[PDB]
Amino acid sequence: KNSKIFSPFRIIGNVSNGVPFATGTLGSTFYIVTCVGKTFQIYDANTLHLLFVSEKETPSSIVALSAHFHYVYAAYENKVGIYKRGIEEHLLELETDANVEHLCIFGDYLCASTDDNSIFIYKKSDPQDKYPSEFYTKLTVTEIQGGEIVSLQHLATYLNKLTVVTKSNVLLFNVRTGKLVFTSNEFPDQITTAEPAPVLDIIALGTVTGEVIMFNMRKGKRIRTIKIPQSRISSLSFRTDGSSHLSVGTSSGDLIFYDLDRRSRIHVLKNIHRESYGGVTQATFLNGQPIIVTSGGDNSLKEYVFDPSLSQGSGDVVVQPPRYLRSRGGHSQPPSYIAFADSQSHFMLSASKDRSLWSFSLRKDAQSQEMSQRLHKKQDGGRVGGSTIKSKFPEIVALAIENARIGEWENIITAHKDEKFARTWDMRNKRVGRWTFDTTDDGFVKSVAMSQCGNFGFIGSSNGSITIYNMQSGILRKKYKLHKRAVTGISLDGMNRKMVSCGLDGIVGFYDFNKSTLLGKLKLDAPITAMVYHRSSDLFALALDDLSIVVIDAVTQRVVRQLWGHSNRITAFDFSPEGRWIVSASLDSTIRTWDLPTGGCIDGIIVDNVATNVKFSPNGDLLATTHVTGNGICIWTNRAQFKTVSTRTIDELNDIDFNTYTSLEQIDKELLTLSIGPRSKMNTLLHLDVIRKRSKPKEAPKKSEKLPFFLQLSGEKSVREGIAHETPEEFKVTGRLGFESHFTKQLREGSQSKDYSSLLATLINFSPAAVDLEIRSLNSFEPFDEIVWFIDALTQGLKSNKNFELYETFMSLLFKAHGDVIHANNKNQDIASALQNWEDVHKKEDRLDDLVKFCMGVAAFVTTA
Amino acid sequence: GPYHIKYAKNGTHLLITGRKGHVASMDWRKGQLRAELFLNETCHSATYLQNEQYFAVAQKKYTFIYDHEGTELHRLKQHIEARHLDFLPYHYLLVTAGETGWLKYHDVSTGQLVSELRTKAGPTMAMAQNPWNAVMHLGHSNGTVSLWSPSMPEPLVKLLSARGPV
Amino acid sequence: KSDFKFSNLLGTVYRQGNITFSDDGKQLLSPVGNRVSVFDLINNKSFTFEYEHRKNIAAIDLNKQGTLLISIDEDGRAILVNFKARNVLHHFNFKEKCSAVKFSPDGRLFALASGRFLQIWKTPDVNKDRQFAPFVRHRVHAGHFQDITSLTWSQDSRFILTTSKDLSAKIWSVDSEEKNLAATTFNGHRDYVMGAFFSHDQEKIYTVSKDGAVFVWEFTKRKYSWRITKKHFFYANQAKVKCVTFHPATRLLAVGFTSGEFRLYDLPDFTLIQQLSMGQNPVNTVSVNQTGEWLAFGSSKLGQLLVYEWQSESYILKQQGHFDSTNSLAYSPDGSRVVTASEDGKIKVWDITSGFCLATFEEHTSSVTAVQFAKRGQVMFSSSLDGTVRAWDLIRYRNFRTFTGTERIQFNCLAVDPSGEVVCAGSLDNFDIHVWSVQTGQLLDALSGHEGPVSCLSFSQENSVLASASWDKTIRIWSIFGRSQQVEPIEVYSDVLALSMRPDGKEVAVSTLKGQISIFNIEDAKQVGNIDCRKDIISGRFNQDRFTAKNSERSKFFTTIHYSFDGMAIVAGGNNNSICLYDVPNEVLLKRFIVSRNMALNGTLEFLNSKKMTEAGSLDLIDDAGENSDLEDRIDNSLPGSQRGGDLSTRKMRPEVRVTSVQFSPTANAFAAASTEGLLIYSTNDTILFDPFDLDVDVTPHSTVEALREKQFLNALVMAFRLNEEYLINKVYEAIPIKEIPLVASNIPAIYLPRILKFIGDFAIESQHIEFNLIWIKALLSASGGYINEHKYLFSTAMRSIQRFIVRVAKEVVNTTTDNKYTYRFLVSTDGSM
Amino acid sequence: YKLDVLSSVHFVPKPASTSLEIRVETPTISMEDAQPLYMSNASSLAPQEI
RNA sequence: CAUUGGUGAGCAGCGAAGGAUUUGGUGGAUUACUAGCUAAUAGCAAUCUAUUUCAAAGAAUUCAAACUUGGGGGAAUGCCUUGUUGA
């Protein structure tokens, strides 16, 4: 189900899945394109950096991918996609319903074999374009000619032919004439791999019993045979730097190296990959180079290099064994636990069922590193126990990282499967720590926590007892015994003052921490499986057994929300970093988001794999989920970091749904109300002469003399919205009826209609220079109409109790500009009556005066005395 | 940085200068280096004087003169911003030009600044020595080559080689 | 409480890079060091983006929809930001030093000059979700031979005209079909081509170079093949062109030189419209408004930023900041503006909302060490290294008082009386405290008794007892007033720097060189409690030093601390890039803020990249200063053993990161920190962070609007207070009628009183409902103004925010209506006859 | 100046100078910086100075 | 009688087909991942060459250029500037 909060971003931590990768060569560099489920990833073979990730997820799993110079051909369910720089350039739909499962690219031809033993040839249109695009013909390998097609290759200098490797036979097609040129003799065991040798017209075949055949595709014979008993052969590669070595790759994870010239066996790299995940799945020599890139199904991609020989005269007979070079990797099993290492959303800690703790980078995949399990020395000097054959720690149930004292001492505290002590780790060194905290009651560790001072770690055992250790020195400090069944959640305040524990007997205990008292105990109605403490708002959420999420605050110890709606057991949940939402995930294959202000479910995602872990970033950037299948970490980005989402409940006052309140324009008509605008407009209007006199430069600029006089008007054709660039619209006063301004025309029309609302709207609209320039030109000479129309317009204005500081400054600007003519023809009847009714409305403005007098006087008295 | 290369006048010694600071005088055909000094200001050019035994390097501003093993012998207070050094081996003269518009001939044997000449054409973009008659061809930002001698305070010849600079 | 976010960056209006305007050119975007500041010049306000480049930024552009910004730093790490959501969309590393980036006029493409390649990418949407790779490359053209200095798009987003250090300029069509219309190159300049522009009709091309020639290129015949028709020259002899721009619609060429002089021309006729000078430093940036009426200039050496309208010859703003040289700050007694005392010898009074400087004061002839307000924002005292304390009226802007000693010492800290009769100042070379009367000017006393340099002074604000603390490991309490002459010395474990004093004068918190903050009861001189802070300090590693950041003893202590105004917290900073705040009852770290992630400053990284450490020295101590294009930055005039002098050119090391003063805001829940990058202002806001106060399951926004619709107004108000949701409090607050404001305000419970007071303050500063807000203030002060008086320090920042509303908008309005009443009475009551 | 900067500005100040300053009267709007706002609209001379 | 001094001889305890210390080399991180080359709107990458040439454009009396000097004193012969005689 599509979401409206979180949108999928990437699935990190994945390197390969055991599709045989492709190598490609731009110039003299090499790239390695490996499939990770439904995307591929391009790596820079000189340093194994992630160059590209394919832009969209394919609708099914990529099953065969190849790479010529700039282009990558990825075959999934039915069709072949041609990709450049990740972005897909073309899509070739095959005309079948059979799944395409092999392909080769040579010449103008792309040849794609399906699983019904048909081969689809595609041709370029004109030999100058970039990829084969048009349909050409179809080839078929029927049951008479050969078995199931096991490989599809083109060995060089073969003019528009194709070597098709079936399970028993080797056919050779001419793909222009559609013909079957040559069908070899049969092979007494089923051949699994093929690789063309750099020797001319020789292919190398690898069988399901242990032998490599060196078939000569022009003579029709076999040149030689190499026998590796009880080993199924999964890869073949050839060295092409003047050393004739072959490298075979065996599905028990072995990489065997042969000299073909002197027929010896150079070396065997044993357990180069896991047999259980496929063995070595693709191994290839980068050509001209002594480095070979292997990749296996255990989510790992390695490089091995041949050093030059140690004998200075012999060389060819003293071949130094291949050593390890760079490699990338991830988890080989799906991860079991997830945490974010820091507030920047840069690193994230991740523990899997293959008993490894990785630290994956969300910024650059080269920085992903496995936290080392090499133990320290014992503190007294005694021996440490354990097996000599070192294995990894039991798989991680829980962990808690708090990098307040990071680099200083131990930083991560982690709890493993069915063992009675919690290890520590250091994230700075990326290694284990010196301390393993015991539970001291012969119970397994069910929960861990640690304080945000970084001094204290908390262990919660399955016999219901919290033990508090010091993270620096590793010793027991305190031990609380409240619960009698397993303690599944411990957390503590951001001020180390109250801790909160929850057990699966369904009691939440509230303890003071500095004093060792309990503050209270609250019995819920189900066993509690998981706690998450949002630490700034002091609200913690519990996943109860009755499939509800109880949100309870620690200050006043009440259940403050209870979220219902999950149909099966809640696997995980986590708070938003602002603490507004809580995202949960449960075994009904769903992920929900709850707005705990309103208490309802904002969004729901039906996801096909069950999400076992959900974590927000400590900024509001990302959600990280972890599912049942898939070795990586699925990463989502909340779209509500860029837009605002409606907190309106899904199933199966728009300002209050979008958490806003646009403040209304005036609350009551008998209430004074300033303008909706900047507060400084009053001061700019009242003192814009002295402000501009300040703003002048100290001496006059150096102009020219042959400057055009109408420079302000002589523009071209971002349009000017000043009072100077104002045109008249559509028999001699100061402004004729063709040359009336907008202000004077609206003032006259308002004097006709006795309603100056449009005049005052224009006045509140335009700028201070325009306001001064309109008020300063108001026909103060013979009958005084425009002055008195402005005055009773301001009267009609400040009768309405809106914008009234602007109407006050407009009256101040009137008295300043030409109050001398009003003083001159004082006792004129029209202007005296206009000022009279202006004072009649304006004398009710002392409400503001004695209101601010009361507030100032009493506020001063209350604050000081 | 990018390495200005210089060979001794018989091909026995190599003198490289990094742009950053790395000046190395070495016997490139044996494996013997005899000076590797990291002068952490931006060096520009170097040359040998009459031997592998002394070399002059043009540093951030001042031209310095180092002995065979790399100890500093001289800091030249003239030669204010050199970018091009060249030694005149029959005359024992270190010739210096650069971002200043000045060309300076310095006698290495006596120690005496022989000539200061105003190019009067801005910074010196290129510089070469005629091995035949030891006159200096400097290329300016006019597209003008000028042939100079340490006797005449004016160029002996001015040629209009290119457009733009040289 | 503790949930502060980076709000603002006062000081430093410009550092390095290009100024940009908006499309509707109301805001200007200014590259401060690795942030970006945006100053809205009409709505008088300002903000700084939260994100942070790791080096100094060098290029800015945002498209003319205003919807997204892209900022590139000085080694090509681009950052694409959503401009409206203020959140960063993508981090994209171009591999080398990008000189310019420009969006197209139609918004859909952007191009940039990375090295000598012009590369055009196409803009991702703002409506699309974030992808792994949102940028899709259009093309990359390589025809220049040296580095490209400028881009210019055409009016239709169809051609792009680039200028290089190589002495040419080229025109490239965007798409392949118009390749024949745009394939020419423009030679003929003697120096670097600094700009190349089209005319309005895209027929003429103007190419301006560094030496001072502007060429007019036209498609004429001597066939038709882009002749040069006229060369005009600036004839500025010593100076040369540093920045060029052209407004094609008004035909306005604006050119700034390396001498501070800028000239602006009307281009195809080449007539000098104006010529005037920013100063003496070079003009690093010119930018022009979309209507061409405003020109924003930036000089990078003094950090100054003009925007200037050239028609009405007048400066819209002429501001200048201070990089790295800021010794002290002080909030105004209402938190409206911050006074900055800076090492080049001057006082600068910066408005906080609008991020600009109102007044500046230069009467100290040396580095001003301390500023402090007194007489409730009327007077301001400062002490400097030139031997003087002096007092400043902030009404008439006059230095009316100057206090010197008799011994010719330099003063490092001061403290004034509450009842400002006496100023007090202490030095770092004299061991005495100098006590001056302010009414007369004389030296009232010299207090003696420290045996070490008096590092810090503070007067208790209530009982007026002086507390000094000095490097002889001793805090000392002087009863000066009224016949006592009493001295109480409290010893402490190590030498003290930054004492601070509680708002009630009961306790004093000292910071020591061990790394601790000890808190003492003044009257009974015994220690109340200490915080051990030297293990939650981020001390980075410098480039020059040969000892790790773990074992360093450079900055694991706080040189400035400050109490919160409820007395419950301490903010603290030092010569390290962490500022930490604590709550003094529990002595635990509330939050630690990383003050810089700029790698151009020194003490930022704790671990230095081992690739940069070579066989002889690190590669960042190598001075590549002679690889520079001109003499004025090939010059080294840095005299050798100089630390904390002046003139950043004269110190030869990278500027270290340090906070020199921290202060809490007296009115609204924030603090300012005087770092080297500027005045960092960290503030909370209540719009985000759902933090309720004892809500239950029946307390809901739905329940609150049902109680509002059913008009239980007090129940709706307390439900919104228990939600603590700002929109709900505002909705209920505006829905309560005037008839029953005093009943609700009398029945508000006492735990929700500071919430409604601080809400009314932060609402009423900018809200228009002036009589409504004053009715609420009058009702609250009348109904519950005894609880406030007996709980002063709870409402000490909520009441200072309220009388920041009464005297600063309401009293200005009342002044205007009063003057109108009196001018009416004069103009109608008197005799105008002849 | 360069001795102070070399000395890393720990120095000993100049002795004393009772100088003489003439201030004209003007609005303190005009005595400010160039920005849209202002801080005080008084006149730089007191009533007892006028 | 103390060593909270050196060198040893041994117990208890810890303790899974061994334990401790020291060191050389390489690989990965040490900034936030959009691929190599070139004469670059494309080619190459097995190769640029036997199309790499023409045309056009393109030249400031700026025909000015040490913003680059440790201090005092001088400068025969130089060099700079100004005048001058003779061509």
Q: What is the 3-state secondary structure (H, E, C) of A155-168?
A: CCCCCCEEEEEECC
CA-based nearest residue to C283, from C202, C194, C220, C219: C194
Q: How open is the CA angle C314-C319-C323, to the nearest 5 degrees?
A: 160
On whether any CB of chain A is under 8 Å from the CB of C709, the answer is no
In sequence order, the 6+-apart residues with CB closer than 8 A to the CB of C140 are: C117, C118, C119, C120
Q: How was this structure determined?
A: cryo-EM
User: Taken in order C482, C485, C491, C495, is the CA torsion positive or negative?
Assistant: positive
Could you tell me which chains touch chain D, where touching means 3 or more CB pairs under 8 A?
Answer: A, C
C-beta within 7 A of nucleic chain E, residues 52-81 of A: 52, 69-72
Q: How open is the CA angle B150-B152-B153, to the nearest 5 degrees?
A: 95
Contact criterion met (CB below 8 Å) for B119 and B140: yes
Q: How far is C475 from C508, CA to CA, in rounded Å?
A: 9
Contact criterion met (CB below 8 Å) for C476 and C469: yes
Half-sphere exposure of C633 (CA within 13 A, CB side): 13
Per DSSP, what are the bridge partners of residue C490? C475
Whether any strand E atom is under 7 angstroms from the Cβ of A729: the reply reads no
Question: Which of C543, C618, C624 has the highest number of chain B CBs within 10 A, making it the mutation to test binding with B?
Answer: C624
Could you say which DSSP state residue A853 is in? H
Could you say which DSSP state residue C806 is in? I
Q: How far is C804 from A46, CA to CA, in rounded Å?
A: 64
Q: How far is C258 from C243, CA to CA, in rounded Å?
A: 9
Contact criterion met (CB below 8 Å) for A123 and A113: no
Q: Find the radius of gyration of the CA atoms of chain D.
A: 18
C-beta within 7 A of nucleic chain E, residues 126-155 of B: 140-143, 153-154
Q: Locate C716 and state its tokens.
A: 């709706």
Per DSSP, what are the bridge partners of residue A225? A213
Contact criterion met (CB below 8 Å) for A382 and A443: no
Tokens 């524990």 identify what position? A501
On whether any CB of chain A is under 8 Å from the CB of C486, the answer is no
Q: How far is C590 from A503, CA to CA, in rounded Å?
A: 29
Q: Locate A20 and state its tokens.
A: 């045989």
Q: How far is C162 from C159, CA to CA, in rounded Å?
A: 10
E strands, C601-713, in order: 662-664, 670-674, 679-683
In this complex, do D38 and A691 lie within 8 Å of one another by their Cβ atoms? yes
> Nearest C-alpha of chain A: how many angstroms from D27?
8
Q: How far is A844 from A799, CA to CA, in rounded Å?
A: 10
Contact criterion met (CB below 8 Å) for C663 and C577: no
Question: Which of A691, A696, A812 has the highest number of chain D CBs within 10 A, making it the mutation to test binding with D?
Answer: A691
Could you say which DSSP state residue C740 is in? G
The amino acid occupying position A762 is T
On whether any CB of chain A is under 8 Å from the CB of C376, the answer is no
In sequence order, the 6+-apart residues with CB closer than 8 A to the CB of A833 are: none
CA-based nearest residue to A793, from A760, A815, A817: A760
**Distance E26 C1' – C578 CA (angstroms):** 38
> Nearest C-alpha of chain D: how many angstroms from C559?
18
In this complex, do D29 and A694 lie within 8 Å of one another by their Cβ atoms? yes
Could you say which DSSP state residue C250 is in? T
The amino acid occupying position A306 is F
E strands, A286-392, in order: 291-296, 300-305, 323-329, 335-340, 347-352, 357-361, 369-370
**Through-space distance between the first and last CA atoms of chain C, rounded to whole angstroms:** 68
A848 chain-C contacts, CB cut-off 8 A: 770-771, 774, 810, 813-814, 817
In this complex, do A680 and D36 lie within 8 Å of one another by their Cβ atoms? yes
User: Taken in order C528, C532, C537, C539, is the CA torsion positive or negative?
Assistant: positive
Q: Locate C59 and state its tokens.
A: 């290029």
Q: Is A2 exposed, middle or buried (0-12, 13-18, 19+ CB in 10 A)?
A: exposed
Q: Which helix (H) or strand (E) holds A94?
A: none
Per DSSP, what are the bridge partners of residue A523? A507
Could you tell me how many residues make up chain A?
865
Q: Is A706 exposed, middle or buried (0-12, 13-18, 19+ CB in 10 A)?
A: exposed
Contact criterion met (CB below 8 Å) for A253 and A271: yes
Q: How far is A146 from A143, CA to CA, in rounded Å?
A: 5
Q: How many CB atoms lie within 10 A of CB A590?
A: 20
CA-based nearest residue to B115, from B143, B84, B139, B148: B148
Does chain A reach chain C with at least 3 CB pairs under 8 Å? yes
Per DSSP, what are the bridge partners of residue A92? A80
In sequence order, the 6+-apart residues with CB closer than 8 A to the CB of B64 are: B39, B56, B57, B72, B74, B75, B76
Tokens 């974030």 identify what position? C130
Q: Which helix (H) or strand (E) holds B98?
A: strand B93-98
Q: Which helix (H) or strand (E) holds A398?
A: strand A396-401
Q: Locate B20 and state its tokens.
A: 């950053």
Whether any strand E atom is under 7 angstroms from the Cβ of B122: the reply reads yes
Q: How far is A714 from C145, CA to CA, in rounded Å?
A: 40
Q: How far is B64 from B58, CA to CA, in rounded Å?
A: 6
Q: How far is B82 from B59, CA to CA, in rounded Å?
A: 8
Q: Which helix (H) or strand (E) holds A860?
A: helix A846-864
Q: How far is C193 from D22, CA to CA, in rounded Å?
A: 50
Q: How far is C565 from C667, CA to CA, in rounded Å?
A: 9
Q: Which helix (H) or strand (E) holds A249?
A: strand A245-250
Q: Give the resolution value in Å.
A: 3.2
Q: Locate A220 and state its tokens.
A: 């029709």
SS3 at position A863? helix
Q: How far is C48 from B41, CA to CA, in rounded Å?
A: 38
Q: How far is A855 from C606, CA to CA, in rounded Å?
A: 53
Closest nucleotide over all strands to A378 (CA to C1'): E14
E strands, A456-527, in order: 456-461, 466-470, 476-480, 487-492, 498-503, 507-512, 518-523
In sequence order, the 6+-apart residues with CB closer than 8 A to the CB of C396 are: D28, D40, D42, D43, D44, D45, D46
- Could you say which nucleotides of strand E lie within 7 A of any protein CB atom? 13-21, 26-46, 56-60, 62, 64-70, 78-80
On whether any CB of chain C is under 8 Å from the CB of A851, the answer is yes
**Distance E17 C1' – A385 CA (angstroms):** 14
User: Taken in order C145, C148, C149, C150, is the CA torsion positive or negative?
Assistant: positive
Q: Is C3 exposed, middle or buried (0-12, 13-18, 19+ CB in 10 A)?
A: middle
Q: How far is A387 from A399, CA to CA, in rounded Å?
A: 25
Contact criterion met (CB below 8 Å) for A328 and A300: yes
Q: How far is C9 from C18, CA to CA, in rounded Å?
A: 18
**Distance E17 C1' – A329 CA (angstroms):** 32
Contact criterion met (CB below 8 Å) for B66 and B55: yes
On whether any CB of chain D is under 8 Å from the CB of C649, the answer is no
Contact criterion met (CB below 8 Å) for A212 and A228: yes
Q: How many CB atoms lie within 10 A of CB C228?
A: 15
Q: How many CB atoms lie within 10 A of CB C181?
A: 11
SS3 at position A763? helix
**Distance E30 C1' – C609 CA (angstroms):** 5
Per DSSP, what are the bridge partners of residue A33? A22, A42
Could you say which DSSP state residue C658 is in? -
In sequence order, the 6+-apart residues with CB closer than 8 A to the CB of A236 are: A193, A194, A195, A204, A206, A212, A246, A247, A248, A249
The amino acid occupying position C502 is R
Q: How far is C77 from C60, CA to CA, in rounded Å?
A: 12
Helix residue spans in C263-324 (DSSP H) = none
Q: Which helix (H) or strand (E) holds A173?
A: strand A170-174
Contact criterion met (CB below 8 Å) for A227 and A241: no
> Please, which residues 1-50 of chain D have a Cβ atom closer than 8 Å to chain C?
2, 4-6, 8-16, 23, 28, 31-40, 42-46
The amino acid occupying position A518 is L
User: Taken in order C534, C539, C545, C547, is the CA torsion positive or negative?
Assistant: positive
Per DSSP, what are the bridge partners of residue C98? C114
Q: Locate A662 and state its tokens.
A: 């646009």
Q: How open is the CA angle A114-A116-A122, to the nearest 5 degrees?
A: 35
Strand order of the β-sheet with C357-361 is: C328-331, C337-342, C346-351, C357-361
SS3 at position C42? coil
On whether any CB of chain D is under 8 Å from the CB of C358, the answer is yes
Q: Locate C486 and state its tokens.
A: 């009493």
On whether any CB of chain A is under 8 Å from the CB of C535, the answer is yes
Q: How far is A375 from A497, CA to CA, in rounded Å?
A: 34
Contact criterion met (CB below 8 Å) for C374 and C383: no
Breaks in chain B listed by the residue before each, with C–N > 2.5 Å: none
Mapping DSSP onto H, E and C, the string for C504-566 reads CCCEEEEEECCCEEEEEECCCCCEEEEEECCCCCCCCCCCCCCCCCCCCCCCCCCCEEEECCC
